[PDB]
Amino acid sequence: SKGEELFTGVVPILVELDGDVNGHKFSVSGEGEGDATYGGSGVTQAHAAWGLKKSFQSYITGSIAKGQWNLDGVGYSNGEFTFSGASGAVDPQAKSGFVKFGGTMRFSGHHGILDLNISNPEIVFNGATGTLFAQVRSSDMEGKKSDYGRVAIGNLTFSSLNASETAASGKATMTLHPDGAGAFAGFYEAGSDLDPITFDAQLGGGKLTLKFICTTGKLPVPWPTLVTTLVQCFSRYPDHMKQHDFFKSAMPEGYVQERTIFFKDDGNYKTRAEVKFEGDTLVNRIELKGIDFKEDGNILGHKLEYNYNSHNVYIMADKQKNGIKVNFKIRHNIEDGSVQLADHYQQNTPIGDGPVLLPDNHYLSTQSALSKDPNEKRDHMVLKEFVTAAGIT
């Protein structure tokens, strides 16, 4: 209650980091503000899962087509192609809105004759039905390609559709829309069954707007590798989950945040930070030590794209240390099309002697966007983040 009251409005932030990675010393200063109460109806993050059609997958990888699929921005888990978005708008009261996604799926078969491309899927929904749209390029039985453009491919019928102030989710059965039947070369009929689709969206979120500058010259590691190190007290905890917000309960005295970040097939970072109020300003002061990095790896060789994915940060109580234990895996895109995993191990313990909230298991849904200030000549990073707590019904 006393800690929560400090975050009801816009709070100024100051970040100070001193690092040493493989003997390369550097310093980063950051400024900006946080609004843990920000939120509207805009989709700040979203995810969908859709197998297209189970029998179509076995066909593409079967002995008639003798083909495969290639994904750019799309994943694959539990037999479904997984997509990510960060654009849309939901009216929670009406259970209606839209979610726009990214990625491409390419299906190949018959010595290149078959070349089905479905990109950037989008959903319009209303609680009873919806439509799934996608940018579709295909080919006929003689190889000749066709551009269908943005086309309606699926008629949705929601088994469930839920929407609250901070989130929306749903699962819908699907039938082939007449407008997308041509993409399947006359093999599927309009109205025939397709795989069901599942989606979840974050509405609004605790918004961080910050700008970081390397005060020692050129940063010796990629800016994306420092995002997690560079104030989880700015997360938006829904009303029904406010008794699980450790971060704000430790304020204003603050907390110590410690991490070990293992970069797969590369070195590791060890960080110690103190996050507390210094007057009206929330300050994050960090010490970072990096060791065992490869000179020509993705980190010291600067082979990581200047972008950031959306992750789930898993939180558990640590009663014996009067704090929390946090775990998550960051996926950094590599310039060659691959992914550099950064395994995060975290501990937070209060600085003060007062009581804190020890939470039930839950997670923070984080979204980050990296950009540059066109008028800034120093090595820098502009970061915009949206974080919402979830996982407790």
Ligand code: HEM
């Ligand atoms: C040389 C050209 C092609 C030949 C000889 C061919 C042959 C076949 C055969 C024999 C099947 C039966 C599936 C089975 O029972 O296992 C089939 C199914 C199918 N074909 Fe092709 N095909 C060709 C091109 C294409 C193209 C260009 C597309 C466009 C996307 C396509 C889409 C499909 C689909 C959607 C099915 C149904 C798969 C299922 O869900 O069972 N085919 N094709």
Ligand SMILES: [Cl-]
């Ligand atoms: Cl960089």
